[model samples]
Target: EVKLVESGGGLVKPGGSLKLSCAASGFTFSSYAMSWVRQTPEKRLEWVATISSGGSYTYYPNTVKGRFTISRDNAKNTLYLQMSSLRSEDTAIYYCARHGVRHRVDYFDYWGQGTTLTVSSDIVLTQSPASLTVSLGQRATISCKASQSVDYDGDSYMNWYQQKPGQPPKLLIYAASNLESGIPARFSGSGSGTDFTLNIHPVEEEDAATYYCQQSNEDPLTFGAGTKLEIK
Candidate 1:
C-alpha cells in the first residue's frame, strides 16, 4: 500500500539548477530512508544517491557529489532533491525509492512512477544467446558486446540486471565485474570496455528470467535487448 509520487521536472540551462520533490504516502515516512534512480533517454538505469528519510545522511557517487543534494521533511512525508549546475547530461527520468537491506533501492516495492525531466542526451549493447534453456545445476553463459568502448577513468561502466515475468529488474553486476552485494557467487560478471560476460554456474531454477547489460559511459546510455533464461 506504500508508494511515492514525485514532482514534475523542468528543463534547465547549463550551470542552472532545479529542485524536485517526492510526496510519500501510506507509510511512516520517517521510519526508512529514500533513494533516487534515473533512466536515460535510451533506457540505461543509473542509481544516483540515497538519503535518510529524516533529512540527514546522504551517499552520492563522487561524480555527482557536488551536483546533488538530498533532503526530506517528514512532517509532510516528503523527500527532496536539489540538482545544481546541471549539465545537458542530466536529462533523464528521475525516480523515487524507499531503501531496503539490499541494493539500496528496491524497484520491487515502494517505488515511484517517476518524474519527467529534460536536459538533452548513444552506444549500443548486443547480447548473445538471446534465449537459453539450461537445466538447474548447470552453467549458463551470456555475453554482451558494446558498439564502442564503455570505459571511463580506468573503469568499465557496464552493468548487468535480471528481471522476472512482471517484476522490476534486479542488479546482478555493476561497474562491469563487481557483483552486487546480495547476489550469490554463482552469478558472475567478467570482461571490460567493449566486451563483457555474465556467467552463471550451477544455475538455479529461480534464475529463469531475462538478463540485460547496460553501459553508462556515453551521453546516450544504452542497454542490451536482453537474454532470456528458461529452466528445463
Candidate 2:
C-alpha cells in the first residue's frame, strides 16, 4: 500500500511558478516509480509526469515537457512536481499514484485522494445521456460524450470514474474495463477507439452515482458530461 500527501495550494499569476509534493508511505521507497496526474473542470485526467523511486529517471508529457520538472527525494520517500509559467489551464486536482503489476503487466494501482490546484480558470465539462436506468440482473450501459476527438489504440486509454455528492471521485475502471482494487465484481467497462462505455451488471442501489468516462489516449485528456444512474 502507498499514500500521497499534498500541501494546500495557493493561487499563482500567469507566468508564475507552482510546486507540489507527494509524500509516500507503506512501500519500499526505492522499489517502485511514482506518477503525477491532474484533472480539471473539463473532467479529463492528464498524466503530467513520472519519476523513479531511486531518483534515477523521470518523464513528462510533451505538453509540459519544457515547463515541468519531476524529481524525487529517495531519503524522504517523496516525489515532487514543479511547474513554471503557470496558466489558468493549470488549475485542476492533482494526484500521485503507484504502479502495480498484475499478470506480469504494470498499471496504476494505488492513488492519492488528490489535491486541488487552482489557476483561477473557468471551464466546464460536458457529458451526455444525462440519465440511465438499469434493473437488477440486467446490463447497464453509460456513455461519456466528449467535445473533442479521443481516437487512440490502447483500450486502457479510456477510463471511467464514479462520484457521489460530498465524496471524492473513485476510479472504478481504467484501460476500459480493468477494475480498480476492491471494486465490486458487478462493475465492468468496455469500448475501443474513441467510444467507451461503463457497464454494470444487476445494477444495485449501492451502484448509483454519477459515472464519468475519460480518454487518456489523446493529449489534453477529455471527459464526458457524466451519467446519473437510477435503479429501475
Candidate 3:
C-alpha cells in the first residue's frame, strides 16, 4: 500500500522553530504533489499549503511567508514543510499529503500520519459570536471552534470545507485550513490560536457557503464538525 512515514512525537516551546517531514516510501515521490495540513488542539482540520515536487505552489492568504515553507528531496523521496519562528498559534498537529491527480484537480490522494506541536505561549480569550465586518479597503477574518471531543493536543484527524448554496461542498480547508484558489479577498482564517472563527467580509451571496467545521478527529471523518451561515 502507498504510505507516508512522518516525524513522530510532540513538541513544547514558546518561540522557536520546528521541522517535520513526510517520507513516501511505497510510491514514486515525483509522481505527485505534496500537501501540508493542520488540526487545532482537539478540533477540525485545516489546510496549510500544497507544494510540488516541481517548483509551482499554492498558499492561503495572510499566512506568514517565512513561517511556513514546503520542499522535497527527490533522491530521498520525501516531502517536507517547515514552520518557522513558532508561536502558540503554530501549535497544532501537522500532516503531509500527496494529491491524487487521476481522481481530480487538487484532491488529496495519500496522507501522512500527523505530527504534534505544543506552545507554552499565552492564550487569548474573546467574546462569543465575535462579530466581524470588512470594508472594501479592509480584509475580513473568521474563526472556527471545534467541539472538545476532537483531538487537538493529539490527532483528531479533522477536515474543513466551505459549502456554498448549490455547488458541491468545495474543499477550501482540507486536512489543514489551506485556502483554495480564487477565494475572495475579503475572507481570511486563523485560530489554532484557539476558538476558531470563519470571518467573511461584506457577506456576499456568491461567497455564501454553508460553513462546516469538522474533525477527522475521529473518522467516519467527523465534521465540527458544525456549519454556519444560513444566508438570507
lDDT of each structure? 0.78, 0.70, 0.56
The candidate that achieves the highest TM-score relative to the unseen native structure: 2
Candidates 1 and 2 compared by lDDT, better number: 1
Ranking the candidates on TM-score from highest down gives 2, 1, 3
lDDT against true structure, model 3: 0.56
- Writing each residue's lDDT as its tens digit, candidate 3 over 1-232 gives 8788779436757666777888788787887777776766644455676666574754532454567787788788877777767777777777776765652223554666677778661111232333333334433454555544343553323334564432323445443444556566455544452355455666665554455554433322333433445345
TM-score quality measure for candidate 2 = 0.72
Q: TM-score, each model?
A: 0.56, 0.72, 0.52
Tell me which of candidates 1 and 2 scores higher on TM-score.
Answer: 2
Candidates in descending lDDT order: 1, 2, 3
Query: What TM-score would candidate 3 get against the native?
Result: 0.52
How well is each residue in 107-173 modelled by candidate 2, as lDDT tens digits? Answer: 4667777777777511223556788877766778776544444444433466677876434457788
Q: What lDDT does candidate 2 reach at residue 111?
A: 75
For residues 92-133, write the lDDT of model 1, one tens digit per residue: 888877754443222223567778678642587889988899
- Candidate 1 lands at a TM-score of 0.56
Candidate 3, which segments miss by more than 4 Å at Cα?
56-61, 121-232
